[PDB]
């Protein structure tokens, strides 16, 4: 487009970013697929642990803090889940950390009780990993999924 009126329209009206929900039924059209779903089931598994080095590296590799999302001009991290015998973070903490670095700081963390596609039976006795729990912006239970 060749003049500022058309610019303004392409950036504010026909731009991708708004068009998350379809006007047909008002449901999502954008999401991740394939590798990214398989990856999520694995990264957010209870069996998933990361050392300080790995945890910090996953964070920085995906945040891109050198962007318009200077929600802070310093990356924030959580304390580890396991303190002793060895400092370890879980996968679910990587998610909490991501949200923590890209949601507004002057605003409380998201609260969600949801479910995913995988029945508890698949993880073992007593599992609750089918239940997706976000409390104050932290993923406290459940894996993340196509759902």
Partner 1 sequence: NTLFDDIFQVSEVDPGRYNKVCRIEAASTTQDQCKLTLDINVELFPVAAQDSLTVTIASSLNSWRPPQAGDRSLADDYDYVMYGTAYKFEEVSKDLIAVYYSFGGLLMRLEGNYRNLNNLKQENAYLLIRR
Partner 2 sequence: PDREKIKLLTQATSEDGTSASFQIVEEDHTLGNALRYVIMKNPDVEFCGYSIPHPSENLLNIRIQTYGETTAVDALQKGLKDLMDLCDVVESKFTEKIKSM
Tell me the site size for partner 2, rule CB under 8 A. 14
Phi, psi at residue 110, to the nearest 5°?
-60, 150
Is the Cβ–Cβ distance between 118 and 103 less than 8 Å? no
Residue 73 binds what, of partner 2, partner 1, none (CB under 5 to 8 Å, by partner type)?
A: partner 2
Confirm or reject binding of residue 121 to partner 2 (CB under 8 A): no
Residue listed under structure tokens 């239940």: 131
DSSP state of 112: E
Nearest to 44 by CA among 140, 111, 119, 126: 140
H or E segment and range at residue 114: strand 112-115
String of contacts with partner 1 for each residue 24-63, x by CB under 8 A = --------------------xxxxxx--x-----------
Positions in 48-67 near partner 2 (CB under 8 A)? 53, 56-57, 59-61, 64-66
Which residue of 99, 123, 137, 145 would you call a contact of partner 1, by CB under 8 A? 123
Three-state secondary-structure class, residue 130: coil
Confirm or reject binding of residue 79 to partner 2 (CB under 8 A): no
| Residue numbers at the binding site for partner 2 (CB under 8 A) | 53, 56-57, 59-61, 64-66, 70, 73-75, 77
């Amino acid at each position: 487009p060749q003049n500022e009126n058309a610019r303004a329209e392409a950036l504010n009206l026909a731009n991708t970013d708004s068009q998350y929900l379809t006007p047909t039924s008002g449901s999502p059209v954008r999401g991740l697929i394939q590798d990214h779903i398989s990856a999520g089931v694995w990264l957010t598994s209870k069996d998933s642990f990361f050392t300080r080095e790995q945890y910090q590296q996953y964070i920085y590799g995906c945040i891109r803090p050198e962007d318009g999302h200077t929600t802070r001009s310093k990356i924030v991290t959580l304390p580890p889940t396991i303190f002793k015998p060895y400092p370890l973070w879980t996968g679910k903490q990587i998610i909490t950390t991501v949200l923590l670095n890209v949601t507004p700081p002057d605003m409380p963390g998201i609260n969600l009780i949801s479910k995913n596609k995988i029945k508890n039976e698949y993880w073992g006795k007593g599992s609750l990993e089918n239940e997706v729990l976000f409390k104050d912006g932290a993923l406290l239970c459940g894996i993340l999924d196509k759902s």
